[PDB]
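Note to self: the last two entries modelled the partners one at a time, which told us nothing about the interface. This time every component goes in together.
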Amino acid sequence: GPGSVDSVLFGSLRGHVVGLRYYTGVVNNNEMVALQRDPNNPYDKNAIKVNNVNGNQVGHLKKELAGALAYIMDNKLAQIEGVVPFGANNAFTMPLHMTFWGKEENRKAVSDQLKKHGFKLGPA
Amino acid sequence: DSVLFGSLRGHVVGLRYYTGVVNNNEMVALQRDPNNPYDKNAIKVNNVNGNQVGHLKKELAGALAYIMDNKLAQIEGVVPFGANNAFTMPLHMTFWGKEENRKAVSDQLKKHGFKLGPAPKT
Amino acid sequence: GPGSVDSVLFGSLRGHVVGLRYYTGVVNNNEMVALQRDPNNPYDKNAIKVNNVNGNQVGHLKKELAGALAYIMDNKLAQIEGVVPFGANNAFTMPLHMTFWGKEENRKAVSDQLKKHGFKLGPAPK
Amino acid sequence: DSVLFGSLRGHVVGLRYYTGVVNNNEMVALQRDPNNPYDKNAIKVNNVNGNQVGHLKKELAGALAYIMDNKLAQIEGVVPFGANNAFTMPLHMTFWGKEENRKAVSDQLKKHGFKLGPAPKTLGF
DNA sequence: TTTTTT
DNA sequence: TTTT
DNA sequence: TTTT
DNA sequence: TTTT
Ligand code: NA
Ligand code: NA
Ligand code: NA
Ligand code: NA
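The predicted structure of the combined assembly is written out below.
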């Protein structure tokens, strides 16, 4: 979502969009994608949809990553921008580059949540 | 309830007339100035501390004012580079809103020749 | 077309795309457009078509502009990149921003050609 | 005779392994190296003097090698900013070719997830 | 020291 | 963090 | 480890 | 007679 004007860069994380065979949303390399929570997903309450900029679903975040990010999105600790760098025509999974922005005071809370699930932000 | 609509690029202008400074990769705020004596569509660009940096170009403001005034989208601005430019400053804008308003936003932009795209902040 | 590896920025120029009502090609603001000479044009031997990046014709360069640029394009004195900054959905005319690239050995000939037609190059971005 | 197909953005990588320097807004040359023992698709990036600066990222080279080898497009590279970076450098690529080859270029790019767009070398000021 | 703020 |  |  |  839109970040506050005092939002700053927290760091980056690499992950994957999965479930591609079940959706038809098209994305190309170097394009933004949207991360969108789907708490009513009957298979995973932590589900995060990945949509293209026109609104069409591309796939889901891998459930292990969703299990970490769900808390961060739900409590608005950071806004997360997704970009597909390569592999946008892949049949089953594609890489995702995620950039985290947020208020300085929320920086530690984000990093701590990621560490809990075995993730860590990389450099700017 | 807000979803990603896409992005636009533009420039902040009139820098020499204001004292607000910006760092590279910093957010900026867009703020309407409807009583501007030269352009009712004016959109100010302010830095994180609230000091004015400049204005959107009149052609861009001409497209966006309707969108802001009718709350059809929230527009996030960031200056990705060229923050120390003398006359104009690059601006990246990301648009967010309700799906019910996606068409109205694209229609308004289209009147002015703009089309939201998929370019990220970085 | 593609420039030589030793090509440098010459400068910039603002102009206009015309004849929009006669073509169905679509362009949006901040998009590149292609400048394509059309010497076989039965109305103007200096004609320069403007196409979108998919190759669909959008219109033509204004004739007074074409009259200055045709020589530069034909003699390959510079490569010209066009961008439509605003007005891409206008009914009849839209503005065009042009940047000029070329070898330093030709920079003078370009400026003298433009100045011959009352045009001049401005600064290119830093 | 060649027409504009569009542009792509990417990065020059492996800078720290080469000595070639680029300045901002300088053109660079793309040169295939089919004998590279790490990657037959390798595309060198050389500066104006012919000195190697780095390589195209392997995923991008994987898409472009076919296009270069079959002369489906001419690719013009410019470094729009970050020319002084130590590790990786932004690259803007403009594609030109014969109209009859436009679909082949787009098909080859699409197989690798790439799509040419309308972004110029510069948006001006 | 532009496309020269809005 | 940071080739091919 | 074949989406979530 | 407001594209070239
Ligand atoms: Na799919
Ligand atoms: Na100022
Ligand atoms: Na038209
Ligand atoms: Na180096």
